[PDB]
Amino acid sequence: LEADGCPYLYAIIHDSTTGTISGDFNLGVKLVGIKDFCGIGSNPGIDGSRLL
Amino acid sequence: PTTDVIAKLDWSIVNEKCEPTIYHLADCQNWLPLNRWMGKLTFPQGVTSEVR
Amino acid sequence: MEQNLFALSLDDTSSVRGSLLDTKFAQTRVLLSKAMAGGDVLLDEYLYDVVNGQDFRATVAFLRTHVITGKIKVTATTNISDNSGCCLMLAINSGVRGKYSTDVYTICSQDSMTWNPGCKKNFSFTFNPNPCGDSWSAEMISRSRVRMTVICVSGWTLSPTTDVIAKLDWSIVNEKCEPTIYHLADCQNWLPLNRWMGKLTFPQGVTSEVRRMPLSIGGGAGATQAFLANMPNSWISMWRYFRGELHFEVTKMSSPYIKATVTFLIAFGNLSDAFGFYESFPHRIVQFAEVEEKCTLVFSQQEFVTAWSTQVNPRTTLEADGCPYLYAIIHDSTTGTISGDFNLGVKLVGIKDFCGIGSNPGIDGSRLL
Amino acid sequence: MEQNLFALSLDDTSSVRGSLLDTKFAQTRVLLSKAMAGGDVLLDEYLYDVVNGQDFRATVAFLRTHVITGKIKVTATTNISDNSGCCLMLAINSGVRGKYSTDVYTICSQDSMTWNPGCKKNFSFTFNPNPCGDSWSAEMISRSRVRMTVICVSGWTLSPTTDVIAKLDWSIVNEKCEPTIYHLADCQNWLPLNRWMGKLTFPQGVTSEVRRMPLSIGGGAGATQAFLANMPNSWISMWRYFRGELHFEVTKMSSPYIKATVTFLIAFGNLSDAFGFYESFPHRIVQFAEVEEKCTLVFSQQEFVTAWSTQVNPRTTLEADGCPYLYAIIHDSTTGTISGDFNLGVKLVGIKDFCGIGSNPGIDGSRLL
């Protein structure tokens, strides 16, 4: 993490999660698409990917 | 729920037109649909501070 | 290359302004225990201290601008499931002295914001920390000791499973600052009072409840062999008799699961709780939808035939009190599939077309709020 | 009361701007010992670190704005009595690698500001830390390792009685960022080089001094069994032969008390120091007033009959060097009622109507600067 020079989408809790019922607050997040996409250069590739 | 639940799916053919969703290798595209799942954020109830 | 440094824009004497992002100077965390109770002081400290370990975009500007011209805006964030609720209040007062009272009554006269997290998921308001003028500054509010107190006016009807946290956001906005100066003119068209009338608590049940709030509001709120007062209440006490169009704000402080229909009217102290014909008087009927929390009652001059005493002798019995009362009555019954009382907050916001009559020599003490 | 927080201006994505007061993000203190010498590195560190313990109006904004669009402006403040002087240089380079050279030659190619505190009492310049584009950001210059080095290019002619301090002020200004990209076009109308030609030192005396700087600038500055080069100098070396209108900047690096009249001209390596008729060639005569420190020489295309070699074999004797030289000659004599040499700094700023001819296979090494 300290060496990752690319940006991250951050999700932060502004106050606190609550409820008069037990349960976690679960959010689903999906990158629908990119507008004005720009691909640069050919990727030779890297095997594998960090955990989702 | 106090019981098992049932969802009813209805399949019909509608009069909207069919359209292709073809991917190509243009460096610049104005809309690259990805639908790439970023993850399921789970925040536990509590006065704690969470960052994803 | 070489420049005339005297000419540069280093002496920029302007107030802070910009987007809300650039205009924010501090954030505060207030902890609401899962068992807070009402009276509970959640955070009480000088306004200035709110800016302490802060490192937001306008923090330095807030501290180094000599004359700030905009208002302070506070935004509170917190929310609970729809089967619970409570009532919080953020208040600002120009100062404190001694072992001061932090009761709702005492703290809500100057600038307050009061909401129910079960009905609203955020709440904001703007204020001018310098009531005499149209500008202030960090150094000024610091040295002059402006206080910021947050209290639980009414606790959770049903406790959240965990302690809860409210996040306060402090920003400077571009609204203009305006004084709120009080003067001795017998007739004024708007006398803001923000005088707390009380917390009505109605137990769930088929029983009949009647609440009587006296309009002879002189003195203050009663306390044990003492009384509490604030500048606005003390000010109206200068007058012997008074009259005007009264404006009240009713807040639903209980969870939205507790339901009741209350009817408000003006009548005299001598009607009995069993009087069966309260609705033969002109009245209003209040019911709150799940998400609703506030209501405004306006009693016009046509509801009062003459002026009444600002204050009545404390030992004045109900049967002998000749001044009008605001009555809160339960139209049907309080209910809920959850245990809890139906709690309402009532505040006399101000009087329109106020009329003060004669000098009040004064009476020591006040009936119980 | 309750608001749609998603709608507020919290996603304000704009660059920092405002008065110089609101637009300042850091200040730096550089210490000039009373015995600094020239070569002396006064402060050398990553640009980003300059923003460390800072608490000015734009510090947070500088760090939290994702895309900054304006230029950085540095202002230096310091000044000495008129009988002393020296020459300082603030330089910016996109990176460093290894046990790098911090010689004037090596550091002044990208963005530099160079002055004499005895002539100027402050000096400022603006720069774009991202030469490929028109925007940058704190995170970018941090991760990409942009360097900021301040050196003494020439020491005090006469020492101040105490150590001196220069105060650097860093602000973001509203000028637009622009790339400074190099390409391989044989003809370009402006090839910025900022190639340091050398420090001319003329001793006080009735003697005759001649300085010869070679225009066959390929390779770099000579060093002990090594050479130093920088991107612009390396770039022009790609060409076998070259030609163009040369633009030079001459800086008076000595105290204003040391006076001399130098004459600049273009001639070949084989004239002797004793040649008595240098002024039979087209030339310019330079004299600096007390407060003047810079001069600009422009040698037009009419001073060169053909193109010359970008680089000549290192072992090429003066008598055999067939390429032109910039000559600096003392017209009268160097004097002063104080001891000190007359020191001039000379830099080839760029070439107008540059013309590169053929590919240079290369020669290892370069004559001494």
Curated annotation (Swiss-Prot), chain B:
After translation, the protein is modified as follows: Not glycosylated.
Q: Where is this site: Interaction with the viral RNA?
A: 15, 31
Compartments it resides in:
Virion
Q: Which domain of life is it from?
A: Viruses
The record lists the membrane-crossing segments as: none
Record annotation: effect of changing residue 31 to F: Complete loss of viral RNA binding and capsid assembly
Role this protein plays: Together with the mature small capsid protein, forms an icosahedral capsid (T=3) enclosing the viral positive strand RNA genome, with a diameter of approximately 300 Angstroms. The capsid is formed from 60 copies each of the large and the small capsid protein. The large capsid protein interacts with the viral RNA.
Indicate the quaternary assembly. Answer: Interacts with the mature small capsid protein. Homomultimer; assembles as pentons. Interacts with the movement protein (via C-terminus).
Q: What is known of its domains?
A: Contains a beta-sheet structure called beta-barrel jelly roll.
Name of protein: Large capsid protein
Q: Which residues of the full protein are shown?
A: 619 to 670 of 1046
